[PDB]
Amino acid sequence: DAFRLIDTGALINNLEPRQTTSNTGLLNKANIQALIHGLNRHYYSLNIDYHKTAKETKMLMNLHKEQWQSGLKMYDYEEKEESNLAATKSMVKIAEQYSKRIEEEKELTEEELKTRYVGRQDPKKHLSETADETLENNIVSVLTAGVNSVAIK
Amino acid sequence: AIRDEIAKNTELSYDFLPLSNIKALLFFNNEKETEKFALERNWPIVNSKVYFNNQSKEKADYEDEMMHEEDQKTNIIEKAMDYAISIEN
C-alpha cells in the first residue's frame, strides 16, 4: 500500500479517477474494510502495479516458477520415490481403504429407481472426494514404473 | 501332408529319439531320404536338430514387429499408461 497526499480535497483540486482502477470501495469493504471510501485523507486512491524486464523474465523462469527443479534432474525423481518407498506401498494401501470406505457410506443412499435412504448430496460427496484419489493412483503408477524404466540396465 | 503335421509337435515334447522312431512313428520308407530333409539347417540327429522341417527356428530378440514386445521398447508398454492422456484431455 502506497500513499499520495491530496492536500485539500474539498472542491476542484484534480481528478484522481483517471489513471487506473479507481472508484473502489464498494459497500463497506475496501482492503482491511475499515477504510471504505475516504481511505486515509481525501481518497488517495491506492493503485499499485508491477513490471518485468527482459532479464527479469528469463531469471524467474529458470529459478522459481512453482518449485525449483533445475540444476539436477534424475535425483528429484529417485529421491521422491526413495523416501516414499515404504510410504508409497503404505499410501497405496492406506488410501485404498479410505477410498472404498467413503464409497461404502454415501453411495448406499441411491440404489433403486425410487427413494430409499433419501440421498441428497451423498452421491456427490464420494464422487468429488474420490475423483483425485483415482487420479493420484495413476500418477504414482507411471512414476514408480518410469523411474526404474528408461535404460539404467 | 501327414509328415508335415506330426513332427511339428515333437519340437517341445520330445527331447531326443533315435532313427527308429523316425521310421516308425512318421512312417518313412527309404533311408537317406531324411538326409535330403537334413541339408540346410544342419541335422546331427544325435539329440535334437529340429526346426528345419515343420516350421522354423526360435530365433531370438523379437522387437518392433506386432503390437507389444519385450526387450528394447518400454514406450508401447508405457503407451498403455499414456493412453489415458488422450482420453482425459
From Swiss-Prot, chain A:
It catalyses: Thiol-dependent hydrolysis of ester, thioester, amide, peptide and isopeptide bonds formed by the C-terminal Gly of ubiquitin (a 76-residue protein attached to proteins as an intracellular targeting signal). GO terms for molecular function: cysteine-type deubiquitinase activity; metal ion binding; metal-dependent deubiquitinase activity; metallopeptidase activity; proteasome binding. Its EC number is 3.4.19.12. N-acetylated by NAT3. GO terms for biological process: mitochondrial fission; peroxisome fission; proteasome assembly; proteasome storage granule assembly; proteasome-mediated ubiquitin-dependent protein catabolic process; protein deubiquitination. It comes from the Eukaryota. The keyword Cytoplasm does not apply. One of its GO terms (cellular component) is proteasome regulatory particle, lid subcomplex. The keyword Hydrolase applies. Keywords: Acetylation, Hydrolase, Metal-binding, Metalloprotease, Protease, Proteasome, Thiol protease, Ubl conjugation pathway, Zinc. The JAMM motif is required for the deubiquitination and degradation of ubiquitinated substrates. Present with 16400 molecules/cell in log phase SD medium. Component of the lid subcomplex of the 19S proteasome regulatory particle complex (also named PA700 complex). The 26S proteasome consists of a 20S proteasome core and two 19S regulatory subunits. Interacts directly with RPN8 and STS1. Belongs to the peptidase M67A family. Component of the lid subcomplex of the 26S proteasome, a multiprotein complex involved in the ATP-dependent degradation of ubiquitinated proteins. RPN11 is the only catalytically active member of the lid and serves as the essential deubiquitinase of the proteasome. This is Ubiquitin carboxyl-terminal hydrolase RPN11.
Swiss-Prot record, chain B:
It comes from the Eukaryota. It comes from Saccharomyces cerevisiae (strain ATCC 204508 / S288c) (Baker's yeast). Belongs to the proteasome subunit S14 family. The lineage of its organism: Eukaryota, Fungi, Dikarya, Ascomycota, Saccharomycotina. This is 26S proteasome regulatory subunit RPN12. Acts as a regulatory subunit of the 26S proteasome which is involved in the ATP-dependent degradation of ubiquitinated proteins. Necessary for activation of the CDC28 kinase. Present with 9890 molecules/cell in log phase SD medium.
